[PDB]
Structures are given as C-alpha cells and as structure tokens.
C-alpha cells in the first residue's frame, strides 16, 4: 500500500503480519496488519470500525486491494506477553494486574453488549501504553475467518486460553468464552506461569480437568452430550484455588473461580464481573514501560 511507510515488522499474527508504519499523509504511525477476501469477511470486518471503546484498539481503516486486506490500527507500543516476560523477575504488581483486568472487563462488557465476541483472547493480543491503559486487539477476526491450526507462517495457534465448551466441540458458543480466556490470563499474570498450557486439544482439556475437576452433569448440565465428550475421560477431583493462584486474595480467587465455571451459563458475565468486590479498591497505576 502506497499510503504507508512500513517502518518495522513488529509481529506475526495468525492471520497476517503486523508492521509499525507511518501514514504518509497524516504522518500518523499505525500498526498495519496484512492478511479478494471472501466477502462476508469484508462486511463483518469493515463493521468493526464503529465498535469503538477506550479499551479496544481503534480500528482506523480497512483497505482491500487485490487479494490483500490491510487493517490499519492505532499503534500501541507493546503487548501483554512481552511486558509479562519483562517482569518474570518480580511479576506485575497486584494493583496494575487489577487495573488491567478491570479495563479488559470494560472492553468486553462493551463488545459483548453489541453482540461481538473476540473468541481468541490471549496475552499476545492485549496491547499496553505508558499511561496505564490496556486494550484488546483482533476482534471479529476470528468470526470473519475462523481460527486455523497453524498461522500463515505455519506457527501453532495456542490453545492455552480456549474455553472448554469450544474444546468439547460446541458449535454455537457465547460471550462466555472470552470470560474464560480472560480468567486464564488473570491467573497467568498473578502467578507468572500459564494456568493451562496444553500442547494439543486433549492435553488442553486434561490440564483443565486436572485443576478444576473432570466435569459431569452435576457441574455442567448437557456436557456428556457435547460432540467430543467421551465417557472414557479420566475422572479427576477438583482442586482448591488457594493452591492454583497464590497469592491472590479471597476476592480475586472468588472472581477467578466464577470466570472459570465449566457451564458457560453460570460463568460470570463481564458486566457482573465489574461489580465484584475485588474491584472496590481498583486504581490505575502507571506501568514501568521500557
């Protein structure tokens, strides 16, 4: 595209590559995502340009030229995964963790009220600035194309944040999947280890089952009728969160437990999450950004 100077490759997506670039007119610097895109795709993506929220990475333009689609986004200078690697040694303080989870819930509360889900939340698509904001990136991209097993660079698309209804074959899942992803990310920022690092689908499910208990009709009506449910699934006993996310306080474990309910129908909504006591004292710290 003529209108942009690519200034650097910043990343590789499932769908495409990201370059930092400069609007050759506005001189705005933007993140330029390179993915005749089969055209529900176009309609459903061009739509996101009005799904605007402070904790949503602004989608400034879509440009469809030849067999290429560029998505043009406000540039944020880094992602949650690098910031969390940048704080292995100490971890993100708790007050910043809370503020991020709060901001992310606001993002989701908004998308979800407009019936839009992300479906692929993960630290790599949460972008942070130096003013203590965090935003969700890559919406409607999973609806508009479905998520593949490799990326365009043949890289493995991670299952670590994927809700159990999706892993169980559910075709028609809901805004709850994103709450499950955000729960996994919340536990990961507190402990500095991913919570469920599956390396395949059945490994992902079994790491889930090992921590939260193999699900049954007690905890999740309808689950034994799911498409990839098997009676032969080993029966693991649930485990106490106090062990899973120390040192989260009671209010944060209580909220985590609700974002991780097996039954998407019981899993706390974003709206409800925003009201939980864990946020009574939430403040917006400044990240240490390097």
Q: Which residues bind ligand MTW (CB under 6 A)?
A: 10-13, 18, 31, 33, 57, 73, 75-79, 124-125, 127, 137-138
> E strand or H helix at 136, and its extent?
strand 134-136
- Which is nearest to 279 in space by CA: 149, 134, 102? 102
Question: Do the annotations mark residue 18 as ligand-binding?
Answer: yes
- Minimum Å gap between C-beta 35 and ligand MTW is 10
The structure tokens 């449910």 sit at 229
Contacts 24+ apart (CB under 8 A), 13-19: 13/138, 13/151, 13/152, 14/120, 14/141, 14/147, 14/148, 14/151, 14/152, 14/155, 14/157, 15/138, 15/141, 15/145, 15/151, 15/152, 16/152, 17/152
Q: Angle at CA 82, nearest 5°, toward 126 and 259?
A: 45
Structure tokens at 92: 């993100």
Q: How far is the CB of 23 from ligand MTW (least distance, A)?
A: 14
- The residue annotated as part of the active site, out of 120, 216, 251, 263, is 120
In the bound state with ligand MTW, the residue whose beta carbon lies nearer, of 30 and 248, is 30
Of 27, 39, 31, which Cα lies nearest the Cα of 6?
31
- Please identify, using beta-carbon distances, which residue of 20 and 271 lies nearer to ligand MTW: 20
6 appears as a binding residue in the annotation = no
For the beta sheet containing 4-12, the strands, ordered from the edge strand earlier in sequence to the opposite edge, are: 4-12, 17-23, 29-34, 68-74, 59-65
Beta-bridge partners for 61: 72
Residue among 138, 113, 100 nearest 272 (CA):
113
Q: Which residue is nearest to ligand MTW (CB)?
A: 11
Q: Which CB, 77 or 150, lies closer to ligand MTW?
A: 77
CB of 72 to ligand MTW, least distance (A): 10
Min CB(33)–ligand MTW separation in Å: 5
Strand-strand pairing, 78-79 and 59-65? unpaired
- Within 10 Å of residue 207's Cβ, how many Cβ atoms? 18
Determine whether the annotation assigns residue 70 to a binding site: no
**Any known ligand binding at 175?**
no
- Residue 194 CB, shortest distance to ligand MTW, in Å, is 17
28 labeled binding residue:
no
216 is catalytic: no
202 assigned ligand-binding residue: no
Q: What's the gap between Cα 73 and its chain centre? A: 17
Binding residues for ATP: 10-18, 33, 74-76, 79, 122-125, 138
Residue ranges at the known binding site: 10-18, 33, 74-76, 79, 122-125, 138
Binding-site residues from annotation for Mg(2+): 125, 138
Active-site residues, by number, are: 120
């Amino acid at each position: 595209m003529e209108n942009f100077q690519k200034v650097e490759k910043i990343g590789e997506g499932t769908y495409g590559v990201v370059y930092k670039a400069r609007n050759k007119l506005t001189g705005e610097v933007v993140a330029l995502k390179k993915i005749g895109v089969p055209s529900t795709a176009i309609r459903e993506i061009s739509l996101l340009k009005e799904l605007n929220h402070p904790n949503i990475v602004k989608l400034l333009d879509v440009i469809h030229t030849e067999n290429k689609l560029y998505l043009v986004f406000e540039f944020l200078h880094q992602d949650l995964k690098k910031f969390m690697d940048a704080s292995a040694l100490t971890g993100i303080p708790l007050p910043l963790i809370k503020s991020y989870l709060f901001q992310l819930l606001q993002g989701l509360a908004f998308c979800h009220s407009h019936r839009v889900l992300h479906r692929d939340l993960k630290p790599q698509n949460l972008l942070i600035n130096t003013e203590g904001a965090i935003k969700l990136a890559d919406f409607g991209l999973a609806r508009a194309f479905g998520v593949p097993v490799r990326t365009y660079t043949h890289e493995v698309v991670t299952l670590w944040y994927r809700a159990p209804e999706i892993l169980l074959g559910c075709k028609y899942y809901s805004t709850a999947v994103d709450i499950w992803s955000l729960g996994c990310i919340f536990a990961e920022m507190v402990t500095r280890r991913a919570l469920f690092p599956g390396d395949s689908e059945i490994d992902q499910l079994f790491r889930i089952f090992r921590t939260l208990g193999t699900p049954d009709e007690v905890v999740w009506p309808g689950v034994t009728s799911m498409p990839d449910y098997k009676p032969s699934f080993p029966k693991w006993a649930r485990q106490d969160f106090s062990k899973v996310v120390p040192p989260l306080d009671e209010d944060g474990r209580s909220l985590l437990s609700q974002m991780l309910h097996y039954d998407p129908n019981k899993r706390i909504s974003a709206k409800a999450a925003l009201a939980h006591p864990f946020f009574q004292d939430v403040t917006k710290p400044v990240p240490h950004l390097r």
